[PDB]
Amino acid sequence: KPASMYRDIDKPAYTRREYITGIPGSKIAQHKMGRKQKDADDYPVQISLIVEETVQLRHGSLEASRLSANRHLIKELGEEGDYKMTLRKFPHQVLRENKDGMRAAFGKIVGTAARVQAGEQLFTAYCNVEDAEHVKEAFRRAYNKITPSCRIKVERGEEL
Amino acid sequence: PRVELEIPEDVDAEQDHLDITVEGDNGSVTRRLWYPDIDVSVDGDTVVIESDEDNAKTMSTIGTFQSHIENMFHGVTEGWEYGMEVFYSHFPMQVNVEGDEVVIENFLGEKAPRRTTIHGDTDVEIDGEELTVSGPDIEAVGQTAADIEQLTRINDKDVRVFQDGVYITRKP
């Protein structure tokens, strides 16, 4: 199913699990990556991937983008490189599909998506000055898998 | 901007409209230098290329006009010469100058002679397996040389195996 079907925020918030059953599990494997035993403050460089447009990102997209980003960090810094990446959003919004025609149209439950407002941090990675260009590359690959245009922003980091 | 090119003692350069002619002991070359708001003129002993605009596109042509003129200075004095070597593996390639065009026979065993016409007052001299393309107009000479190499072009088969042809050996 194309994202065109779910990317917009044209529907009421639909997250109350006490009134919604049969919700598919999330495909997102992890939210905390790298060295989760270490603190973010232990790093000189902090780069975030910022969403430029308000949208809904299906859990399948979060996984694909997160995967393609962390997979790169692993390939360039090693399975235990000195870095830590975070996917701060969780797919709370439940999605439907009307899969009879328009009669009794209320859709059956098909998935979940995360609502992200423009200007927000979807991903935030923490690394050393050396690995700064590696995290910028992970993010480049990550924004190619989500609907909106993004900004790769260096927050804590002035070895520039 | 403005750039001044002091013409060599050996040379004398005349100019009318958008055309510039450069004459030397080795010949004469006339060229059209036409571009928006770029004035080329002969101020006694120097050629002047100037313009009231300084945008990227204008600067590009100004620098281009300079080298064009400088190349003309060199062409009417020292001249331009391209060196070429005719190489073949199985079939003896016959390269001859006939009229105003260089002809190549028996290329890769071909019955039909490959040929190309020489540009301008360009001279092609052959001494065995060596060729020398020369003249005062770098444009004409450069093309004549290139055309000769392009004349033995092969697309049908693997060039790494079928390397026959005339190639540019020395470039001025």
Binding site: - | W34, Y35, P36, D37, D39
Partner: protein, 142 residues
């Protein structure tokens, strides 16, 4: 064969549309106009796109027909017709009191209308009407 033109316009190095616009206005005011040196008239832009537009007009047509001129003669004449209500009495009279010529069949040199002249020293992206006709397949009779 003789045309008592009250005004003789020289189109050499002039922007066809700007000339046409003025020639249309004058013809509607009662003036008999003669456009001279049409082959040397000019239109600004990228030659490749300009040519495509005119080639398309040649190709267009059917049984009812779409006769589009190839010679710089007609191109200019047609350009003027588009600035006149040629189907109305007043429009047709004005149009018929206007004639375009290849070169200058008159003794007098034409006058250059204000704001129509193109400076070749300041422009490189433009085309000659004659060049367009040659590309269209016209017989260079000028």
């Amino acid at each position: 064969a003789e045309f008592d033109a009250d005004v003789i316009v020289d189109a050499r190095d002039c922007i066809m549309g700007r000339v046409a616009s003025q020639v249309a206005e004058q013809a509607l005011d009662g003036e008999t106009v003669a456009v001279v040196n049409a082959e040397r008239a000019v239109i600004t832009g990228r030659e490749e796109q300009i040519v495509e537009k005119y080639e398309k007009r040649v190709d267009i047509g059917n049984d009812n027909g779409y006769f589009y001129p190839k010679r710089p003669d007609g191109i200019f004449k047609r350009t003027i017709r588009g600035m006149l209500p040629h189907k109305k009495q007043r429009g047709r009279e004005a149009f018929e009191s206007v004639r375009v010529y290849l070169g200058n069949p008159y003794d007098e040199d034409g006058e250059v209308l204000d704001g129509t002249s193109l400076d070749r020293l300041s422009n490189i992206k433009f085309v000659t009407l004659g060049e367009i006709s040659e590309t269209l397949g016209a017989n260079k009779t000028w």
